[PDB]
Symmetry: C2
């Protein structure tokens, strides 16, 4: 069709839009012929009426095509082009290990990640703690790294799924962000644009999650699986727990250290290990690198044990302009916080629950996140040695270790940490790290 | 409240907005702090959820106050400040007679009219056919005319209900125009802003009407009556027929002549007389100028018979910079069309129905209306001697007399006129001019 009003109206009256109309609208958004008021109205219409699977796929496909779509056939990489994505959380440093691990197993990961949104952290921000790390290599450089190293974690360019920038920006201030059809599209517009063969989704569940309840998480997970597979990308998704910090730390540089220590075998948080292994297993299978789940786990465990994964990580850091001896001297490069003191509970007991969102916001306020785009982040601030649910706390076991930039910064953060962690007398019932797997 | 997103969201979730929130939003629209995307979303939310009477009144009141509101207490006009409004139609020249008539009966009419929208014509455009007529006098001048003459028909200024300009403009391209709550508000934001005591609404019904069916017309009529009275303005409304041209002509100058001839007693279309008398009766009563309906009709008939009404009309035209001898020499000033030829039906029979919208569009295309704001109108083109429903047509009785600016213009218009008027063998059932009266 060719009239925005008519298309907004058609959908407004509960009619399912045609591919030709969606394509038109999206192209118009990209072309700047469609106005902000018109993006807001359609979005509010898709909210009130949702969208059928065919139109959901049309939207994602349309957004994906509004810009550049990577093609890896030229490089002739005889190995799968796979990637992972997460709905975000706190302490979710999985991507820094998952990337190298999967790459060490014969996969190729053109990970176009992002920055911290609201209470959740952003991989790109964590990586930019590494002195000299470049998240924006030229396409020709990106290709070289993916060919030589097998993995690269870069930021999104203006050329990637352009329509989405205009779209999200609008729905962000028009109350049209919580809509499975649209959420699914933003997520997939970017990932599909990477010219993937397989993809695994990490849809968080819990107090640190994006979606309010387990049902909404499950739903979103399903929408994405159907649509991603509908567009021709082998996609599987896992519902993961985010009712407490996943890794043992929360921040930027603190989480990078934890990744290196994880990769080097010095320390591996058990939950983080589960989630990380799980997402990788899915990738090895979907990417056809391994057929049996047990075969996937075996290969991955191998790369962790022999150091191949750690080596690929260092090669990546170097390849993206970072230090040539990072996994060896990471301590010499990563900025340390001024003040590092532990915070203890006002009472003894077991950690029964923690408002992970609140913990997420506490790091932002410490300066480790952005309340606004123009904000500069302090790569040193953050939490370390996070107490886990079920942990008995006392004066010889802190709730967390706070890396603050000054006393006032510490005092405030400590207050927030103590208020977000609820203690009980009896140990809480253990909830699973990985709830379920989804596929079509 | 103070957050647009939150307010859009509150309403989005079916919650009724508070006066404080509406006021905020509207003030924001006026202040330019609220974006187009945000006006579109709320509007689409008010569409899907409608609004309660209290919030409907809040919206109108808020829009009314976003700008200037006239006050007539300074002038100490010992007579009511009344006015009329119509949802528009074709051949709806009632305002040009209604104004002077009511004024001659002791009322005061600060009529802030408008221009032609879509298929309907606009009083201001008709009046601007009069050489030198000024629809934009300074407020001080407007007041003088209203004090001396009792009636003035001017165009809306930027200062009048400012929020509405931004609002309508947006909903016009976002598919959020057909919404009783919002429609009611635009209409009332302007009228209430005139500092009225009483108001009468002419809500059209039919093929030339704005609202699709009699139910929607009745509904809108009721919304307006409740809200207008809720804001403290004695308001009554009448459902009028627009299933055929109301007056005998359709255009700008052609309709001005018809008004003068009506006022002078040379010729009075029967339906137009009914509708015009009816609206005036309502105004005399609401304005307390007459208590009995029969007393209203008597007074009005009197001003028509003794020429007082015609005299007030001339005084108005002069007062607004028009000719001092218009009702006397209107022929000497009003532009005549180049080509004036009658169009006859391809067959004999009775006029059973006519697509008044189509007839409205035919005048626009002839150049007597605007398809776009930048368009200049030909004040000479139009239809005259319109055939009425039930009229037997033959070679000695044309469908209408077309005033075109050139042969090609005539040929095309004639085609449209013949295609919009449906003939039958048997005479159609006569429908009422005035369907019903509404009040609270």
């Amino acid at each position: 069709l060719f009239l925005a009003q008519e298309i907004i109206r058609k959908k407004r009256d509960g009619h399912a839009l045609s591919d030709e109309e969606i394509r038109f609208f999206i192209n118009g958004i990209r072309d700047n012929t469609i106005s902000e008021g018109q993006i807001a109205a359609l979005a509010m219409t898709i909210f009130f009426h949702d969208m059928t699977m065919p139109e959901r796929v049309s939207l994602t496909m349309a957004m994906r095509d509004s810009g550049t779509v990577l093609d890896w056939k030229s490089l002739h990489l005889n190995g799968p082009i796979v990637d992972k994505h997460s709905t975000g959380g706190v302490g979710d440093v999985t991507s820094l290990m998952l990337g190298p691990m999967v790459a060490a197993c014969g996969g190729y990961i053109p990970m176009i990640s992002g920055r911290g949104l609201g209470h959740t952290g952003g991989t790109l921000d964590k990586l930019e703690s590494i002195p000299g790390f470049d998240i924006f290599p030229d396409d020709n450089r990106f290709r070289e790294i993916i060919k030589d190293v097998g993995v690269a974690i870069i930021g999104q360019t203006s050329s990637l799924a352009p329509a989405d920038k205009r779209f999200y920006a609008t729905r962000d201030i028009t109350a049209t962000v919580d809509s499975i059809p649209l959420i699914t599209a933003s997520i997939l517009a970017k990932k599909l644009a990477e010219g993937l063969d397989a993809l695994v989704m990490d849809v968080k569940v819990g107090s640190g999650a994006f979606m309010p309840t387990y049902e909404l998480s499950e739903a979103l997970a399903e929408a994405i699986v159907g649509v991603a597979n509908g567009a021709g990308v082998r996609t599987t998704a896992l519902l993961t727990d985010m009712n407490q910090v996943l890794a043992s730390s929360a921040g930027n540089a603190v989480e990078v250290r934890e990744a290196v220590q994880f990769l080097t075998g010095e320390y591996r948080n058990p939950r983080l290990f589960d989630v990380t292994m799980a997402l990788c297993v899915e990738m090895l299978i979907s990417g056809k690198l391994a057929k049996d789940d047990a075969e996937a786990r075996a290969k991955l465990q191998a790369v962790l044990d022999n150091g191949k994964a750690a080596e690929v990580f260092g090669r990546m850091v170097a390849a993206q302009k970072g230090p040539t001896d990072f996994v060896e001297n990471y301590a010499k490069y990563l900025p340390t916080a001024m003040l590092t003191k532990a915070v203890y509970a006002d009472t003894e007991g077991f950690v029964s629950e923690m408002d992970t969102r609140a913990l997420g916001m506490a790091v932002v306020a410490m300066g480790g996140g952005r309340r606004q785009a123009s904000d500069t982040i302090d790569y040193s601030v953050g939490f370390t040695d996070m107490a886990r649910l079920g942990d008995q706390v006392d004066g010889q076991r802190p709730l967390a270790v706070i890396h603050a930039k000054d006393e006032n910064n510490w005092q405030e953060a400590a207050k927030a940490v103590k208020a977000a962690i609820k203690l009980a007398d009896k140990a809480p019932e253990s909830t699973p790290t990985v709830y379920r797997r989804i596929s079509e």
